[PDB]
Design a protein around this ligand. Structure first.
Ligand SMILES: *[C@@H]1O[C@H](CO)[C@@H](O[C@@H]2O[C@H](CO)[C@@H](O[C@@H]3O[C@H](CO[C@H]4O[C@H](CO)[C@@H](O)[C@H](O)[C@@H]4O[C@@H]4O[C@H](CO)[C@@H](O[C@@H]5O[C@H](CO)[C@H](O)[C@H](O)[C@H]5O)[C@H](O)[C@H]4NC(C)=O)[C@@H](O)[C@H](O[C@H]4O[C@H](CO)[C@@H](O)[C@H](O)[C@@H]4O)[C@@H]3O)[C@H](O)[C@H]2NC(C)=O)[C@H](O)[C@H]1NC(C)=O
Ligand SMILES: *[C@@H]1O[C@H](CO)[C@@H](O[C@@H]2O[C@H](CO)[C@@H](O[C@@H]3O[C@H](CO[C@H]4O[C@H](CO)[C@@H](O)[C@H](O)[C@@H]4O[C@@H]4O[C@H](CO)[C@@H](O[C@@H]5O[C@H](CO)[C@H](O)[C@H](O)[C@H]5O)[C@H](O)[C@H]4NC(C)=O)[C@@H](O)[C@H](O[C@H]4O[C@H](CO)[C@@H](O)[C@H](O)[C@@H]4O)[C@@H]3O)[C@H](O)[C@H]2NC(C)=O)[C@H](O)[C@H]1NC(C)=O
Ligand SMILES: *[C@@H]1O[C@H](CO[C@@H]2O[C@@H](C)[C@@H](O)[C@@H](O)[C@@H]2O)[C@@H](O[C@@H]2O[C@H](CO)[C@@H](O[C@@H]3O[C@H](CO[C@H]4O[C@H](CO)[C@@H](O)[C@H](O)[C@@H]4O)[C@@H](O)[C@H](O[C@H]4O[C@H](CO)[C@@H](O)[C@H](O)[C@@H]4O)[C@@H]3O)[C@H](O)[C@H]2NC(C)=O)[C@H](O)[C@H]1NC(C)=O
Ligand SMILES: *[C@@H]1O[C@H](CO)[C@@H](O)[C@H](O)[C@H]1NC(C)=O
Ligand SMILES: C[C@@H]1O[C@@H](O)[C@@H](O)[C@H](O)[C@@H]1O
Ligand SMILES: C[C@@H]1O[C@@H](O)[C@@H](O)[C@H](O)[C@@H]1O
Lengths: 193, 207
């Protein structure tokens, strides 16, 4: 039995649907879901198997945004019985600082440049970062996991890669960050030559 | 029954002829009745006999733990030789074995770029000096920070991250007082990786 938390972007906008996932040979399992009180609205995927001939029943509970965000605990009961609990990390959320950073002058000799988004000082570590230009999203980026900082908050970097030609010619790129301590759960910093 | 775990040398260890890379094999959950165990060590499938095995040590959960350390030739490791630890118990005839080696694939040289703090970050007492290391393979790597010779130990570094082209990148953030930066001090980022010349390069940074 293993209990996973919902995706960051899904809890931070009322339009998404956040979601707790409980993931688990000859005689398979009843799921019970209490929320710090039994709940009945979880859906359950049928048993799919693997190379090792074990079943893998996944169950999915749909959680309320403020429930998950206000710290409510989520209990998965997979039957005797075995348990597992999760909730949001405890503690005063902290607002992230978002800085864009142009490519190194030593990188300008490559045919592709790195645009950097440093996100600093947020808590808890749940966060989504994205990249845009001209309103359309940018595919070619990669974001590092949150890394605990000497001060108990978190940072990460996100690296967007573009042809040098798009950067040289003045195109504007934006780093979009979603975190609960941000006003409207969202901020963006733009970058350009 | 019992479990075996096998741990690689540290990146820094294999990259400097002066250090001592070691592979460590650990047996846990050895039943405390008749707890006589054996280690056998294989490099590329051929047995070797230079490992150094500690006495078994009783743990606080009614089980015994035994640890066996094999010293490794630097170039053996970076050449991808395979290290097998076989662990046998004399009472039950069965055995457990694990295999470790450097990640397979063609090594790729890291690029290192220093990025100064952002202008908006200058309104704070703490500024972040960034070191982007990218395009390297495998992901074993050591990064460090210096200023004016001495070590600068207020930094964090990210796990290697797999990039679109099969290489890895990481960032390393050194945090310093805005005054030290503005007074013009050079700070240096140090990178050790097997695909660097002398397994070592160093980029500097300043106002
Ligand atoms: C037979 O073989 C099968 C298949 O190999 C075995 O199943 C495996 O069992 C392992 C346990 O023995 C288990 O290992 C644990 O893994 C977790 C981490 O799991 C995540 O990451 C794995 C990669 O490391 C993935 O394989 C997992 O599937 C899982 O991925 C995440 O899964 C989430 C659940 O859905 C999903 O989140 C949801 O996403 C949706 C949208 O998709 C919604 O938004 C929803 O709201 C979300 O909740 C994520 O997207 C998904 N992400 C990724 C990147 O995959 C690991 O933490 C755990 O560690 C425990 O123990 C260690 C001890 O050191 C400790 O460090 C931890 O703290 C923790 O206590 C285990 O290592 C395998 O993951 C699992 N394989 C699966 C499930 O595919 C069977 O076990 C075998 N037979 C038997 C008898 O066991
Ligand atoms: C009874 O009590 C015993 C005693 O504790 C229990 O033993 C534990 O069992 C655990 C599982 O059964 C096992 O967990 C695995 O852990 C590894 C990582 O462990 C390392 O890091 C831990 C801290 O998080 C330590 O507790 C561990 O001791 C271990 O430390 C590493 O030790 C290495 C060898 O000494 C060392 O390498 C050397 O280091 C020197 C310098 O010290 C040199 O550099 C040299 O060159 C190196 O060779 C490492 O540095 C050191 N690491 C650190 C961070 O300090 C984990 O990876 C592993 O994960 C498995 O499972 C997951 C999924 O679950 C999977 O994804 C993995 O791929 C892998 O399959 C295990 O989780 C513990 O290690 C172990 N504890 C000890 C102390 O041995 C029993 O379990 C108990 N039994 C009962 C029944 O209760
Ligand atoms: C650590 O290892 C210990 C030693 O392990 C043994 O030796 C190794 C080399 C392996 O072969 C291993 O497989 C061996 O077990 C281990 O200790 C052993 O533990 C098991 C159970 O854990 C014990 O087995 C049980 O023995 C009892 C006692 O039997 C005596 O009493 C009856 C009278 O009541 C006599 O008539 C007998 O002839 C014996 O002299 C049994 O009663 C019991 O049977 C029960 O279960 C069966 C079904 O399985 C039912 O039909 C019965 O009605 C009973 O309800 C078990 O067979 C074993 O005796 C014990 N031996 C020693 C020397 O320690 C220890 O468990 C290991 N520890 C860990 C944490 O793994
Ligand atoms: C233990 O099993 C192996 C493989 O079956 C066998 O070669 C070995 O001889 C056995 N041990 C003894 C003492 O015979
Ligand atoms: C096929 C299996 O799927 C799941 C993983 O956690 C296992 O390691 C393996 O890849
Ligand atoms: C002796 C064992 O070794 C290690 C600890 O993390 C375990 O809790 C236990 O104390």
């Amino acid at each position: 039995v293993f209990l996973f938390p919902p995706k960051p972007k899904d809890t931070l906008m009322i339009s998404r649907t956040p979601e707790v996932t409980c993931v688990v040979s000859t005689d398979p399992v009843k799921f019970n879901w209490y929320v710090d009180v039994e709940v009945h609205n979880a859906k359950t995927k049928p048993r799919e198997e693997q190379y090792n001939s074990t079943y893998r029943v996944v169950s999915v509970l749909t959680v309320l945004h403020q429930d998950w965000l206000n710290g409510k605990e989520y209990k998965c009961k997979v039957s005797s019985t075995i348990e597992k609990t999760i909730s949001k990390a405890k503690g005063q959320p902290r607002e992230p600082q978002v800085y864009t950073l142009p490519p190194s002058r030593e990188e300008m000799t490559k045919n592709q440049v790195s645009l950097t988004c440093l996100v600093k000082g947020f808590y808890p570590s749940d966060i989504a970062v994205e990249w845009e230009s001209n309103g359309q999203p940018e595919n070619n980026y990669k974001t590092t996991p949150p890394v605990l900082d000497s001060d108990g908050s978190f940072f990460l970097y996100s690296k967007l890669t573009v042809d040098k030609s798009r950067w040289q010619q003045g195109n504007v790129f934006s780093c979009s960050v979603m975190h609960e301590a941000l006003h409207n759960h969202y901020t963006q910093k733009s970058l350009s030559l």
